[PDB]
Structures are given as structure tokens and as C-alpha cells.
Amino acid sequence: MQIFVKTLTGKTITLEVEPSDTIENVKAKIQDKEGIPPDQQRLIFAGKQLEDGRTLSDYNIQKESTLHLVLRLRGG
Amino acid sequence: MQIFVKTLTGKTITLEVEPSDTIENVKAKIQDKEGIPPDQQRLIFAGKQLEDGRTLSDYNIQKESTLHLVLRLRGG
Amino acid sequence: SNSQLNAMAHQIQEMFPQVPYHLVLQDLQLTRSVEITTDNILEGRIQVPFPT
């Protein structure tokens, strides 16, 4: 199934994944297309944060769902 | 006596209870009136969370007191 | 103007469908960076919809 990741810049990335895929792997795929480190990649879904050690089936993430990419920079 | 329960939506309901009433029983009333499962009913009073197996007098809850009802949505 | 501020805030509003719009515009004037604004919300710098 294909999903759509929306970036804060208004960019829409299309990713081909399966319900059995892990959140960690999804972010790794984004690093393959964009290059952004998964450590700084906070995946949010409908306002809820997706735990790295989870699957798409855990949050009922279906196809064509919008994945929110949140950034984080703690320097103080 | 009467108590006021306020939800995150701002909605406020008045519940008829007595000091001898148990929190578990009170939340059960909300479960039937609003349809909210007790498993997702988090009753907070004065910053402190109330336990199910406790009475209203256990926390010295007086009449016309406002209780905060927070939901627990997990897996959705 | 607040044109760019609104545009940036609305973007975050789509990410977090449970955050006060006026609070989003608030941090947007302080940090002025969506990379930190949305972060601040997740950390707990922004007040959530709590009854009172």
C-alpha cells in the first residue's frame, strides 16, 4: 500500500509500505529519499506520536494515510 | 448532593451523588449517561487523581465541586 | 502582515488537530521555526486543551 508523508515545508512524499512494516523502517525509508536522520524524525498521526518500536497496524494506519513529520532540536 | 464534571471539550455535566457514593460508581453513571467507558475515564480533582475504590468523602469532595474528566485513547 | 505567520501556523494546525491556533501563532513569533515550534508542543511548552 502507498502512504503520503507531509513535511512542514508542504512537501508530500509517497512511500510504498505494508501494514506489517515498522515505524522505524518507515523513517529509514524517508532517510533514503530525503536523507533526514530518523533520530530527528518524529512521526505524528492525527496528533498522536508514533513510537519507533511499533507497526502501522498498531495505530490502524491504512493506505493513503497522512503521516505528519515533526522535527526536534534540543540545544538547551 | 450535586457535582460538576467537565470534559476536555468544555462540556460540563451535573451528577447526583452522595458522600457514600464510590468513584467507581460515579464513573459508571457517566458511562451510561455519556457512553464513555470507565477504562477511559480519568477523574482528576484538585490536581490529584481519584481512585475507583474510594468514596467522595475519602477526598472530602463537597457539593458543587468541579471534577476534570480526561479520556484515555490508546490504539486510536 | 502576519501572512507568513498564518501560513506556517496553519501547516502545524494540520499536523496537530488538537492544538490551540492562537498558541501556535504565539510560538511562531518567538522561535519562528516550525522545526522548533512543533517540537516545543510535543515537549510540553504549549498548554493542552485541559478543562478548568
> Distance of alpha carbon C48 from its chain centroid, rounded?
11
Residues on chain B touching C50 (C-beta within 8 angstroms): 8, 68, 70
Neighbouring chains to C with at least 3 Cβ pairs closer than 8 Å: A, B
- C-alpha C41/C-alpha A58 separation (Å) is 23
- What cell does B18 get? 452522595
Residues on chain C touching B3 (C-beta within 8 angstroms): none
For A6, the 3-state DSSP assignment is strand
What letters, b where the CB count within 10 A reaches 16 and e where it falls short, cover A16-38? ebeeebebebbbebbeeeeeeeb
Question: What is the CATH architecture of A1-76?
Answer: Roll (3.10)
User: Could you tell me whether strands A66-70 and A42-45 are parallel, antiparallel, or unpaired per DSSP bridges?
Assistant: antiparallel
Residue of C nearest to A43 (CA): C15
Residues on chain A touching B76 (C-beta within 8 angstroms): 59-60
Q: How far is A51 from chain C (nearest CA, A)?
A: 13
Q: Where are the beta strands (DSSP E) in chain B?
A: 2-7, 12-16, 42-45, 48-49, 66-70
- C-alpha A27/C-alpha A43 separation (Å) is 8
Cα atoms in the Cβ-side hemisphere of radius 13 Å centred on C47: 8
| Total domains, chain C | 1
Among all chains, which residue has been given the C-alpha cell 515550534?
C37
For C46, the 3-state DSSP assignment is coil
| Identity of the amino acid at B1 | M
Neighbouring chains to B with at least 3 Cβ pairs closer than 8 Å: A, C
Which CATH number is C23's domain given?
A: 1.10.8.10
For A49, the 3-state DSSP assignment is strand
Which residues of A make CB contacts under 8 Å with B?
48, 58-60
B42 neighbors B27 (Cβ within 8 angstroms): no
CA terminus-to-terminus distance, chain A: 40
- What cell does A48 get? 498522536
Method: NMR
B25 φ/ψ angles, rounded to the nearest 5 degrees? -75, -40
A24 φ/ψ angles, rounded to the nearest 5 degrees? -60, -45
- Containing structural domain, residue C34: 1-52
A11 neighbors A18 (Cβ within 8 angstroms): no
A45 neighbors A67 (Cβ within 8 angstroms): yes
Which residues of A make CB contacts under 8 Å with C?
6, 8, 10, 42, 44, 46-47, 49, 68, 70-74
Residues on chain B touching A59 (C-beta within 8 angstroms): 75-76
Angle, nearest 10°, between helix axes C3-15 and C21-30?
120
Q: What is the DSSP string of B8-20?
A: TTS-EEEEE--TT
| Identity of the amino acid at C13 | Q
- What cell does C33 get? 521555526
Residue B51 backbone zone (phi > 0: left; psi -120 to 50: alpha; other: beta): beta
Residues A68, C15: C-beta atoms closer than 8 Å:
yes
CA terminus-to-terminus distance, chain C: 34
> Distance of alpha carbon C41 from its chain centroid, rounded?
7
For C18, the 3-state DSSP assignment is coil
Residues A73, C38: C-beta atoms closer than 8 Å:
no
